[PDB]
Amino acid sequence: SQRMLSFSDALLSIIATVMILPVTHTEISPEFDRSVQRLLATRIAVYLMTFLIVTVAWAAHTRLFQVVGKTDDTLALLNLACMMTITFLPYTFSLMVTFPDVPLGIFLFCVCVIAIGVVQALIVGYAFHFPHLLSPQIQRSAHRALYRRHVLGIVLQGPALCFAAAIFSLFFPLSYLLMVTVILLPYVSKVTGWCRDRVFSFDLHEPLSKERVEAFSDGVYAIVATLLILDICEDNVPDPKDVKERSGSLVAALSATGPRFLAYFGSFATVGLLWFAHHSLFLHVRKATRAMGLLNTLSLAFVGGLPLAYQQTSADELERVRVSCTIIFLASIFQLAMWTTALLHQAETLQPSVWFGGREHVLMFAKLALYPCASLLAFASTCLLSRFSVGIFHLMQIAVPCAFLLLRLLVGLALA
Amino acid sequence: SQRMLSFSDALLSIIATVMILPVTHTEISPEFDRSVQRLLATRIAVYLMTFLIVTVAWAAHTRLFQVVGKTDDTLALLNLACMMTITFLPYTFSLMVTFPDVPLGIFLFCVCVIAIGVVQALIVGYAFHFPHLLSPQIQRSAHRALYRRHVLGIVLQGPALCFAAAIFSLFFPLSYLLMVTVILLPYVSKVTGWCRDRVFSFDLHEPLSKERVEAFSDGVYAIVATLLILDICEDNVPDPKDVKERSGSLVAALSATGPRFLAYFGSFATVGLLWFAHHSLFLHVRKATRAMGLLNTLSLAFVGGLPLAYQQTSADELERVRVSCTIIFLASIFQLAMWTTALLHQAETLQPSVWFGGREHVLMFAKLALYPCASLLAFASTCLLSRFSVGIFHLMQIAVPCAFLLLRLLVGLALA
């Protein structure tokens, strides 16, 4: 009844992160640094916007399926169609980006989004056609029943805007920006600008379920961790024709991939550590608020960029680590931002054990703040020349959590 | 306490399917068909053996974490280390395959497996050092407590064999087959050959938990479905420098990727339909037996190959569909095999709603057997020349489950 959601967002993870592939697959070797840097920046921007749009579409989808509590075979088929459409998103986005002036690209992206909208429209129509079967709960069923007239709008207002943008494409298309409204309307507008009412249970932009965001984050963490060690594998086979390469001695020609091997090692270590922080935190969240997921999206966005950082590290250029440092910091600090959200609702979120002055509050606090502090140290490394020591530092990084249940005891020793 | 398992097997899904990448990324165009076919066969065999070994490692891991009911931060860190080690499996396997005569490759594969062995040994040692904390249940805690002395063996007998095989490579490695025993020992040997006892709760080769195998299958289904879409996307951007290709008219250069576009468009439908069958079935399984997961592994193995089939379809060569038909059949028939295991334990597995003569037993039966029957009807193309008709039938294929809940009503009309 709910596993379909698990398959859905597991697919959506991998979809979101698809655009990270050309980032890693670029050639950092200057065998032209200005133009290749500009191309890498373009690809990074495309990936970031892609993750953002796939994430907001995923949020719309999970909200919709939260307003649909049960599941039918036909419902599952419609969800599969919706998944296919939303899957087609990143390609359309990249196409529209690398061809902004041609109306065909924007038209393709817009037909993609109106398609991902109309299938959800059929989904909610099916739902409201079978109340006793697919309504979430009693209040979702026993109510004014106008929720459809309401929720339809929320599912339709997004794509409908595209409609106008659609007709604006080849009309004569300076604006071209209504798509951005599709992002901004459901996030803040209904919260601030104007809502529609006339007992109520909104379910319009209610906070995501902890399990759904949790599964999505786990999916993306995995697909980055395995994203690295999966290009080495498919691209670093010693090529048995290597009899000419290196003598024989396979170890010789194997040590050539050593740099990117250690790169994958460190990247997986850092990604797994970040996931461990994320899992320890989200194990203690009681009801993940909207701001929580909002911050989580950005944290995941930078975690996705992390492999490019770790590849740049193991490639006056001693500034590379600097870059590959900030990403880590970013990929952690927004996470820490979530941790600095207990003050928003200690009673509703962050179940009492982790409250200010809780049984292990300092423990969780330092376990989350450990990576931003380490990245800040490797950043301030700038003060000297032996900055490439960052590696051993991050080494010591992973050495902390094992003894960290005891290292916090040191702060306990600070009782006197 | 359990989500760590979800992240673990979500990671292991991708880690299993990594070796599918060079299969798709080959060049089917004969711009040498004998040698390229031999290379594709080598890659397919490598992928199949890779999925098998990663699957048996995942089975060992999930059994272990089933005999470890709770979780600790240190335990999660050890699990992350185990995940990195088992992640290193497919590369070592491919290396050993493409270099069987050199002892370095087999030694690398063997150190890779002894690593995941020893880290799991530390895991179970930690577990048995904290009974009240990390033992699964009362019987797992209040017992003869020799389970360690037992379970250690099961976790160590696999890698330890490699140990011998290891040295068998270095000194002077015709056997090279003890690794195969590492696969065959935990599956059947302890079941048939010799077990060790002296109240008992085996937890040695107990049937996998339904949720774990279910999540692994969902992960792999998502990753193949999106696997085709990663290729189109990273590799089919219309490269604005295409101003030489075609005039402008982006639709022109876009229609060049049309073939593989439709290829993905159909492959995703097929994979999603297979997953829908899988989800409908596994929604009704009460306690997935060992044979159930055993069949599920092979079904997933062929589902993983499915994209090569769908790519070969949209590439006298009509017989290609033949190939891309059988795979589907395979990728479904083992599925149906799992369904035919209802007779094994109707009371224990396959909760009574779907029993022989149940409320919707015929419904589930047909929903599972639809794809093998359709693939057989397409295979019957050998009787005529209009074979590619399969496509439209495959189209009709996806159109069937939508009306399924009513098409089985025809059987009701067959009451007279």
Short mmCIF file of C-alpha atoms in Angstrom, two decimals, chain A residues 35-393:
data_model
loop_
_atom_site.label_atom_id
_atom_site.label_comp_id
_atom_site.label_asym_id
_atom_site.label_seq_id
_atom_site.Cartn_x
_atom_site.Cartn_y
_atom_site.Cartn_z
CA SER A 35 37.11 27.20 -21.56
CA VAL A 36 37.10 23.84 -19.77
CA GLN A 37 36.46 25.67 -16.50
CA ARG A 38 33.58 27.56 -18.12
CA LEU A 39 32.19 24.25 -19.40
CA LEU A 40 32.50 22.65 -15.96
CA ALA A 41 30.70 25.65 -14.46
CA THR A 42 27.91 25.32 -17.02
CA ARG A 43 27.55 21.62 -16.22
CA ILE A 44 27.53 22.31 -12.48
CA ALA A 45 24.81 24.93 -12.88
CA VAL A 46 22.78 22.56 -15.06
CA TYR A 47 23.14 19.83 -12.44
CA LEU A 48 22.13 22.13 -9.58
CA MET A 49 19.05 23.46 -11.35
CA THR A 50 18.22 19.89 -12.41
CA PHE A 51 18.37 18.60 -8.86
CA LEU A 52 16.27 21.55 -7.71
CA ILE A 53 13.52 21.01 -10.28
CA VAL A 54 13.44 17.24 -9.79
CA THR A 55 13.30 17.82 -6.04
CA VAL A 56 10.38 20.24 -6.21
CA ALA A 57 8.55 17.86 -8.54
CA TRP A 58 9.26 15.04 -6.09
CA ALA A 59 7.88 17.19 -3.27
CA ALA A 60 4.70 17.82 -5.25
CA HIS A 61 4.44 14.09 -5.95
CA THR A 62 4.93 13.00 -2.35
CA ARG A 63 2.44 15.61 -1.14
CA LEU A 64 -0.08 14.29 -3.67
CA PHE A 65 0.45 10.72 -2.56
CA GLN A 66 0.13 11.89 1.03
CA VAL A 67 -3.33 13.16 0.07
CA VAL A 68 -3.93 9.67 -1.37
CA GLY A 69 -3.63 7.27 1.56
CA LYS A 70 -4.37 3.92 -0.17
CA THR A 71 -3.30 2.39 -3.52
CA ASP A 72 -4.89 0.53 -6.43
CA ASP A 73 -3.36 -1.39 -9.32
CA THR A 74 -4.66 1.28 -11.70
CA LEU A 75 -3.35 3.89 -9.27
CA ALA A 76 0.06 2.22 -9.33
CA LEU A 77 0.00 2.23 -13.14
CA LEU A 78 -0.82 5.94 -13.19
CA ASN A 79 2.03 6.49 -10.74
CA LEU A 80 4.34 4.61 -13.11
CA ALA A 81 3.29 6.87 -15.97
CA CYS A 82 3.90 9.92 -13.77
CA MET A 83 7.32 8.51 -12.90
CA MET A 84 8.16 8.13 -16.59
CA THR A 85 7.14 11.73 -17.26
CA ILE A 86 9.06 13.17 -14.30
CA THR A 87 11.98 11.00 -15.39
CA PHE A 88 11.98 12.76 -18.74
CA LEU A 89 12.56 16.05 -16.86
CA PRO A 90 16.38 16.37 -16.63
CA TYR A 91 16.96 15.78 -20.34
CA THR A 92 14.37 18.40 -21.28
CA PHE A 93 15.94 20.78 -18.77
CA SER A 94 19.45 20.31 -20.15
CA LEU A 95 18.08 20.73 -23.68
CA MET A 96 16.28 23.96 -22.81
CA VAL A 97 19.40 25.26 -21.05
CA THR A 98 21.81 24.60 -23.90
CA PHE A 99 19.20 26.05 -26.32
CA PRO A 100 17.43 28.95 -24.60
CA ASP A 101 16.78 31.10 -27.67
CA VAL A 102 15.15 28.34 -29.74
CA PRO A 103 11.48 27.98 -28.74
CA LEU A 104 11.60 24.22 -29.29
CA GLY A 105 13.66 23.59 -26.16
CA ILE A 106 11.44 25.59 -23.82
CA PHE A 107 8.42 24.01 -25.50
CA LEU A 108 9.86 20.55 -24.81
CA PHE A 109 10.54 21.32 -21.15
CA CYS A 110 7.06 22.81 -20.85
CA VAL A 111 5.27 19.87 -22.46
CA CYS A 112 7.25 17.65 -20.09
CA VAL A 113 6.03 19.55 -17.04
CA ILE A 114 2.40 19.83 -18.23
CA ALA A 115 2.57 16.08 -18.85
CA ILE A 116 3.85 15.37 -15.34
CA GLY A 117 0.97 17.56 -14.19
CA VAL A 118 -1.89 16.01 -16.14
CA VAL A 119 -1.06 12.47 -15.04
CA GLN A 120 -1.24 13.62 -11.42
CA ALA A 121 -4.53 15.30 -12.32
CA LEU A 122 -5.89 11.94 -13.46
CA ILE A 123 -4.47 10.42 -10.27
CA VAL A 124 -6.33 12.82 -7.99
CA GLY A 125 -9.46 12.47 -10.11
CA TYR A 126 -9.34 8.70 -9.66
CA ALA A 127 -8.79 9.26 -5.94
CA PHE A 128 -11.75 11.60 -5.46
CA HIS A 129 -13.87 9.24 -7.55
CA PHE A 130 -13.34 6.45 -4.98
CA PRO A 131 -13.49 8.15 -1.56
CA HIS A 132 -13.91 5.09 0.66
CA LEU A 133 -11.11 3.34 -1.23
CA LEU A 134 -8.33 5.90 -1.70
CA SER A 135 -8.98 8.68 0.69
CA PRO A 136 -6.23 9.01 3.32
CA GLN A 137 -8.29 9.24 6.51
CA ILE A 138 -11.70 10.06 7.97
CA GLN A 139 -11.18 13.83 7.80
CA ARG A 140 -9.84 13.37 4.27
CA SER A 141 -13.06 11.49 3.44
CA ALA A 142 -15.69 12.93 5.81
CA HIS A 143 -15.38 16.64 5.03
CA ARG A 144 -16.83 19.32 2.76
CA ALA A 145 -15.48 17.13 -0.10
CA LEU A 146 -14.50 20.30 -1.98
CA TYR A 147 -10.85 19.36 -1.33
CA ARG A 148 -10.71 18.15 -4.93
CA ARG A 149 -11.64 21.61 -6.26
CA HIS A 150 -8.86 22.76 -3.96
CA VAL A 151 -6.14 20.16 -4.43
CA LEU A 152 -6.65 20.03 -8.20
CA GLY A 153 -5.60 23.67 -8.32
CA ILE A 154 -2.41 22.94 -6.41
CA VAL A 155 -1.65 20.11 -8.82
CA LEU A 156 -2.76 22.18 -11.81
CA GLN A 157 -1.53 25.70 -10.99
CA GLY A 158 2.05 24.54 -11.54
CA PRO A 159 1.66 23.09 -15.04
CA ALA A 160 -1.04 25.60 -16.06
CA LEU A 161 1.48 28.43 -15.69
CA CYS A 162 3.75 26.52 -18.07
CA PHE A 163 0.79 26.58 -20.48
CA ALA A 164 1.07 30.36 -20.72
CA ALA A 165 4.85 30.13 -20.94
CA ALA A 166 4.22 27.53 -23.64
CA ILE A 167 2.22 29.98 -25.75
CA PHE A 168 4.77 32.67 -24.90
CA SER A 169 7.59 30.60 -26.40
CA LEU A 170 6.90 31.10 -30.12
CA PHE A 171 4.50 34.04 -29.78
CA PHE A 172 7.20 36.68 -30.27
CA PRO A 173 9.87 35.12 -25.45
CA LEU A 174 11.63 37.70 -23.31
CA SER A 175 9.76 36.64 -20.18
CA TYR A 176 10.33 32.86 -20.39
CA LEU A 177 10.31 33.00 -16.59
CA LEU A 178 6.88 31.64 -15.65
CA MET A 179 8.63 28.30 -15.03
CA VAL A 180 10.39 29.93 -12.08
CA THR A 181 6.95 30.89 -10.78
CA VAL A 182 6.04 27.19 -10.96
CA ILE A 183 8.80 26.78 -8.39
CA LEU A 184 7.97 29.84 -6.28
CA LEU A 185 4.16 29.55 -6.22
CA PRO A 186 3.77 26.32 -4.17
CA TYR A 187 6.65 27.06 -1.84
CA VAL A 188 5.88 30.48 -0.35
CA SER A 189 2.99 32.14 -2.23
CA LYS A 190 0.13 30.05 -0.85
CA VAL A 191 1.82 30.30 2.56
CA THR A 192 2.00 34.10 2.40
CA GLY A 193 0.02 35.54 -0.51
CA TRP A 194 -3.46 34.00 -0.65
CA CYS A 195 -5.02 30.73 0.51
CA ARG A 196 -8.57 29.54 -0.13
CA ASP A 197 -10.99 28.26 2.51
CA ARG A 198 -14.76 27.71 2.69
CA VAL A 199 -13.18 22.32 10.11
CA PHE A 200 -10.08 22.06 7.92
CA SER A 201 -7.07 19.79 7.41
CA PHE A 202 -4.89 21.62 4.91
CA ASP A 203 -2.67 18.93 3.35
CA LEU A 204 -1.86 21.60 0.76
CA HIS A 205 1.80 22.26 1.61
CA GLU A 206 1.96 20.20 4.80
CA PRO A 207 5.42 19.06 5.95
CA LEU A 208 6.73 15.97 4.22
CA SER A 209 6.57 12.63 5.98
CA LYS A 210 9.87 11.82 7.69
CA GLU A 211 10.09 8.42 6.01
CA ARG A 212 9.79 9.79 2.46
CA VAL A 213 12.46 12.49 2.73
CA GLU A 214 14.58 10.00 4.68
CA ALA A 215 14.37 7.41 1.90
CA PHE A 216 15.11 10.02 -0.76
CA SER A 217 18.19 11.22 1.13
CA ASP A 218 19.40 7.66 1.61
CA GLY A 219 18.91 7.00 -2.09
CA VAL A 220 20.92 10.01 -3.19
CA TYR A 221 23.67 9.35 -0.64
CA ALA A 222 24.00 5.92 -2.03
CA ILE A 223 23.97 6.99 -5.62
CA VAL A 224 26.82 9.41 -5.06
CA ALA A 225 28.92 7.02 -2.97
CA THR A 226 28.52 4.34 -5.62
CA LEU A 227 28.65 6.96 -8.38
CA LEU A 228 32.38 7.32 -7.93
CA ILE A 229 33.45 3.74 -7.47
CA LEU A 230 31.34 2.95 -10.51
CA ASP A 231 33.28 4.99 -13.02
CA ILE A 232 36.57 3.63 -11.81
CA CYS A 233 35.18 0.16 -12.28
CA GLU A 234 33.77 0.61 -15.71
CA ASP A 235 36.67 2.78 -16.90
CA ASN A 236 39.79 1.37 -15.18
CA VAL A 237 40.15 -2.23 -16.37
CA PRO A 238 43.86 -2.87 -17.05
CA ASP A 239 43.14 -3.64 -20.74
CA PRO A 240 44.89 -7.05 -21.20
CA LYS A 241 46.38 -5.52 -24.34
CA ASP A 242 48.55 -3.77 -21.71
CA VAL A 243 51.37 -6.19 -22.60
CA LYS A 244 52.68 -3.21 -24.56
CA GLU A 245 51.66 -0.82 -21.79
CA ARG A 246 53.81 -0.54 -18.66
CA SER A 247 56.30 -5.09 -19.42
CA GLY A 248 53.75 -7.32 -17.75
CA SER A 249 53.50 -7.04 -13.95
CA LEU A 250 49.81 -6.08 -13.81
CA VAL A 251 50.48 -4.22 -10.54
CA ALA A 252 52.52 -1.70 -12.54
CA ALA A 253 49.76 -0.63 -14.94
CA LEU A 254 47.28 -0.96 -12.06
CA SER A 255 49.10 1.64 -9.96
CA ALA A 256 48.24 4.18 -12.67
CA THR A 257 44.64 4.26 -11.43
CA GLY A 258 45.93 4.66 -7.86
CA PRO A 259 45.21 8.41 -7.73
CA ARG A 260 41.54 8.09 -8.59
CA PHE A 261 41.39 4.95 -6.44
CA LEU A 262 42.35 6.95 -3.36
CA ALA A 263 39.99 9.65 -4.63
CA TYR A 264 37.10 7.20 -4.54
CA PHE A 265 38.27 5.97 -1.13
CA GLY A 266 38.13 9.43 0.41
CA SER A 267 34.92 10.36 -1.37
CA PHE A 268 33.12 7.27 -0.11
CA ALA A 269 34.47 7.84 3.40
CA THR A 270 33.18 11.41 3.45
CA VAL A 271 29.82 10.58 1.84
CA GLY A 272 29.23 7.71 4.25
CA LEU A 273 30.15 9.92 7.19
CA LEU A 274 27.74 12.61 6.02
CA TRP A 275 25.05 9.96 5.65
CA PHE A 276 25.81 8.72 9.16
CA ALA A 277 25.31 12.22 10.52
CA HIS A 278 22.10 12.51 8.50
CA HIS A 279 20.81 9.18 9.81
CA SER A 280 21.69 9.92 13.44
CA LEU A 281 19.90 13.26 13.13
CA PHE A 282 16.81 12.03 11.28
CA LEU A 283 16.52 9.14 13.71
CA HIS A 284 15.71 11.80 16.33
CA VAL A 285 13.40 14.08 14.30
CA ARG A 286 9.79 13.70 15.42
CA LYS A 287 7.92 15.48 12.61
CA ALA A 288 10.13 16.94 9.88
CA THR A 289 8.84 20.45 9.22
CA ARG A 290 8.81 22.15 5.82
CA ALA A 291 11.96 24.15 6.59
CA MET A 292 13.68 20.89 7.53
CA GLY A 293 13.12 19.35 4.10
CA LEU A 294 13.92 22.67 2.46
CA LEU A 295 17.37 22.65 4.06
CA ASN A 296 17.78 18.92 3.41
CA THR A 297 17.31 19.53 -0.31
CA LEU A 298 20.26 21.93 -0.46
CA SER A 299 22.41 19.66 1.70
CA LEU A 300 21.75 16.79 -0.70
CA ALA A 301 22.43 19.13 -3.63
CA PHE A 302 25.95 19.81 -2.41
CA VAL A 303 26.54 16.19 -1.37
CA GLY A 304 25.86 15.40 -5.01
CA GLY A 305 28.62 17.79 -6.04
CA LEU A 306 31.08 16.25 -3.55
CA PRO A 307 32.59 13.68 -6.00
CA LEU A 308 33.80 16.43 -8.33
CA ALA A 309 35.50 17.93 -5.29
CA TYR A 310 37.19 14.68 -4.28
CA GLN A 311 38.28 14.09 -7.88
CA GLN A 312 39.79 17.58 -8.05
CA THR A 313 41.64 16.86 -4.80
CA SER A 314 43.46 13.71 -5.98
CA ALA A 315 44.26 15.15 -9.42
CA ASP A 316 50.27 26.97 -7.14
CA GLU A 317 47.27 24.73 -7.89
CA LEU A 318 47.40 23.61 -4.24
CA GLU A 319 44.24 25.74 -4.04
CA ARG A 320 42.26 22.77 -5.42
CA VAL A 321 41.71 21.42 -1.91
CA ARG A 322 40.36 24.87 -1.02
CA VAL A 323 37.57 24.36 -3.56
CA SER A 324 37.06 20.72 -2.59
CA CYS A 325 36.99 21.94 0.99
CA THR A 326 34.16 24.46 0.71
CA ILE A 327 31.86 21.91 -0.95
CA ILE A 328 32.25 19.62 2.06
CA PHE A 329 31.58 22.59 4.33
CA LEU A 330 28.52 23.45 2.25
CA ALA A 331 27.44 19.80 2.04
CA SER A 332 27.59 19.75 5.84
CA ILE A 333 26.61 23.24 6.96
CA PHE A 334 23.11 23.15 5.49
CA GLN A 335 22.76 19.82 7.26
CA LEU A 336 23.83 21.58 10.45
CA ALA A 337 21.22 24.19 9.52
CA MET A 338 18.56 21.51 9.97
CA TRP A 339 20.04 20.76 13.39
CA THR A 340 19.65 24.45 14.18
CA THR A 341 15.91 24.01 13.77
CA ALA A 342 15.00 22.43 17.12
CA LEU A 343 14.34 25.93 18.46
CA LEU A 344 11.56 26.23 15.88
CA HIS A 345 9.53 23.47 17.56
CA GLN A 346 11.20 21.50 20.35
CA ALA A 347 7.84 19.98 21.27
CA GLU A 348 6.79 19.06 17.72
CA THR A 349 10.20 18.20 16.22
CA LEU A 350 13.40 16.75 17.68
CA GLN A 351 11.81 14.29 20.12
CA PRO A 352 12.56 15.24 23.76
CA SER A 353 15.69 13.12 24.20
CA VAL A 354 17.77 15.49 22.06
CA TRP A 355 16.35 18.73 23.49
CA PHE A 356 18.50 21.55 24.85
CA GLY A 357 20.21 19.92 27.81
CA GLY A 358 18.95 16.46 26.90
CA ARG A 359 20.52 13.11 27.66
CA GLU A 360 22.81 13.27 24.61
CA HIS A 361 22.11 16.73 23.16
CA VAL A 362 25.79 17.71 23.14
CA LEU A 363 26.57 14.32 21.57
CA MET A 364 24.26 14.81 18.58
CA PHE A 365 25.28 18.47 18.34
CA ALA A 366 28.97 17.72 17.98
CA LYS A 367 28.31 14.67 15.79
CA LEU A 368 26.56 16.98 13.33
CA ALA A 369 28.95 19.94 13.68
CA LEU A 370 32.08 17.80 13.34
CA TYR A 371 32.31 18.01 9.55
CA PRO A 372 31.76 21.79 9.21
CA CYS A 373 34.42 22.39 11.87
CA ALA A 374 36.90 20.08 10.13
CA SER A 375 36.24 21.71 6.76
CA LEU A 376 36.70 25.12 8.39
CA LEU A 377 40.06 23.99 9.75
CA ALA A 378 41.18 22.70 6.35
CA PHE A 379 39.99 26.05 5.01
CA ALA A 380 41.97 28.14 7.51
CA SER A 381 44.90 25.93 6.49
CA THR A 382 45.45 28.84 4.06
CA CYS A 383 47.39 30.49 6.90
CA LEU A 384 50.34 28.19 6.07
CA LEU A 385 51.87 26.24 3.17
CA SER A 386 51.46 22.66 4.42
CA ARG A 387 47.76 22.71 3.55
CA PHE A 388 47.74 19.37 1.70
CA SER A 389 47.78 17.82 5.19
CA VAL A 390 43.98 18.17 4.92
CA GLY A 391 43.95 14.52 3.87
CA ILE A 392 45.31 13.16 7.14
CA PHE A 393 42.99 15.61 8.89
#
